[PDB]
Amino acid sequence: VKQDMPPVGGYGPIDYKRNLPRRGLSGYSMFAVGIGALLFGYWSMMRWNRERRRLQIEDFEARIALMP
Amino acid sequence: KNFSLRIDELEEMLTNNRIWRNRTVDIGVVTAEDALNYGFSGVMLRGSGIQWDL
Numbered sequence: 001v002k003q004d005m006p007p008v009g010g011y012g013p014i015d016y017k018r019n020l021p022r023r024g025l026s027g028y029s030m031f032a033v034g035i036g037a038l039l040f041g042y043w044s045m046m047r048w049n050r051e052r053r054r055l056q057i058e059d060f061e062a063r064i065a066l067m068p
Numbered sequence: 069k070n071f072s073l074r075i076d077e078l079e080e081m082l083t084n085n086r087i088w089r090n091r092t093v094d095i096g097v098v099t100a101e102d103a104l105n106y107g108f109s110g111v112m113l114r115g116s117g118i119q120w121d122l
Contacts, residue, residue: 014069014072015069015072015073016072017076018076018079019076020076020079020080
C-alpha cells in the first residue's frame with residue numbers, strides 16, 4: 001500500500017477574477033441628489049430666516065416703546 | 069480560495085485610489101534602451117516594454 005498525499009478526487013475551481021461590483025449609481029443621479037437636498041436646505045433656511053426677521057422687528061418694537 | 073478573496077479586497081482598498089495614483093504615476097520612467105543597457109531584470113523587464121520571462 002501507499003500513503004503519500006495526492007489530490008484525493010481532484011480539487012474544485014479557484015477564482016481569480018477582478019470582481020468589482022461597482023457599487024453606487026451614475027454621477028448625474030449624484031448631482032441631482034446633491035442639488036435637490038441643497039435646494040431643500042435653502043428653502044427651509046429662507047423660511048426660518050424670515051420668521052426670525054418678524055420676531056426681530058417685534059423686539060425693535062419693544063425697544064422703541066420702552067425708551068422714554 | 070480565501071487569499072483570492074483577500075487579494076480582490078486589497079485591489080478594492082488601493083488601486084484606483086486617486087491620491088495613491090497621483091502619488092506614483094508621474095515618476096520613474098524607464099527607457100527600453102536603458103532597460104537593456106543598465107541590466108534590469110524581472111519586474112523591471114516585465115513592466116518596461118519588452119516581453120521576457122525566464
